[PDB]
Write a protein that binds this ligand. Structure first.
Ligand SMILES: Nc1nc(=O)c2ncn([C@@H]3O[C@@H]4COP(=O)(O)O[C@H]5[C@@H](O)[C@H](n6cnc7c(N)ncnc76)O[C@@H]5COP(=O)(O)O[C@@H]3[C@@H]4O)c2[nH]1
Lengths: 179, 180
């Protein structure tokens, strides 16, 4: 129930209007446009623990330092909720693929998940650590259900679920190859 | 409870770190500090319908067109969810009081409410308009409880509840004047 609202908010307040124009947005940067092996879809990071380092380069998920920040994308300006020209931008990362050419992709954590974690820590009485795990599952399936119902979001995103024990670089490299 | 999550997200993902220094953020702009009748607190707009025009100046809520966009504040930069330096800024508005001196304040709609509205329209089976009305109340009470439990957020915000039939300019002028 609570995860349901977070999934809808994640769509209506973000994904619905940032995914259809994600490809077009990236092309505005020469540094990004001239790039090969750059998948033009949002890789939504969904860790099972619901916690992450807001900074991915050299994060705990990236032990070998194969992931590197390539600068943000052109910020999308949109007026919403009385706030003029609110900024919607994404971070481009560089993933070393051994001796091969490095990979480039947009990586973002599912921000509603941070609410679930913070709730479990700040108010364990409303959301227990056990209850938190259940809502993550609901969130994923609900979000997937919503996005699958949006033709404009078709092939504009990739849900990357992984446990925090996994090497983010390894997990990412597989999905990057599978494209 | 869906409204509970929306309230917590509105806090943890926004209000918790934008409210305590909201005043200081405003002072960074020369045009704003020297301004009189300028309350340095976020007036969170909470319409009962949960729907609004994203542009308040000359909006449907502002018939007499007394509200005017006076520019945004210096954006607060913070890296969140793998996104480097997300921008968190607010819009300053000017409210005309007839021939008298105008008022200045930050006005924002409660963005989680738009989710409640959109849910009621897209999937009425999951969230009916009757259930939506109940969830707005829960959201409001929850949001108040959360903010009241944070002294850093004390007296740095103002919840402005109103029906979409009322004149936003009037309601705001009332709230601003009653706070002396
Ligand atoms: N008025 C206003 N100005 C803001 O800057 C702002 N930032 C957040 N919020 C509201 O706080 C709550 C929690 O924030 P969160 O990041 O976890 O979820 C966000 C986040 O997952 C995603 N999103 C929205 N804007 C951005 C953005 N600029 N960058 C990345 N992700 C974003 O979409 C969700 C819903 O956004 P909103 O529908 O605008 O309202 C949010 C939300 O209800 C804001 N409200």
């Amino acid at each position: 129930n609570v995860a349901d609202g977070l999934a809808w908010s994640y769509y209506f307040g973000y994904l619905k209007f940032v995914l259809p124009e994600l490809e077009k947005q990236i092309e505005k940067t020469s540094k990004f446009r001239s790039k090969e092996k750059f998948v033009k879809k949002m890789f939504i990071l969904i860790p099972s623990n619901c916690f992450w380092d807001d900074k991915i380069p050299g994060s705990d998920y990236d032990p070998q330092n194969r992931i590197t920040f390539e600068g943000n994308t052109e910020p999308l300006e949109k007026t919403r909720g009385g706030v003029f020209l609110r900024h919607y931008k994404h971070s481009v990362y560089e993933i070393k693929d051994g001796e091969n050419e490095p990979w480039f992709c947009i990586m973002e954590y599912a921000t509603p998940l941070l609410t679930l974690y913070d709730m479990s820590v700040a108010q364990p009485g409303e959301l227990s650590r056990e209850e938190r795990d259940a809502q993550v599952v609901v969130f994923l399936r609900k979000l997937q259900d919503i996005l699958e119902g949006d033709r404009a979001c078709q092939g504009k995103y990739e849900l990357v679920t992984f446990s925090p024990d996994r090497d983010l670089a390894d997990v990412m490299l597989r999905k990057l190859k599978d494209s």
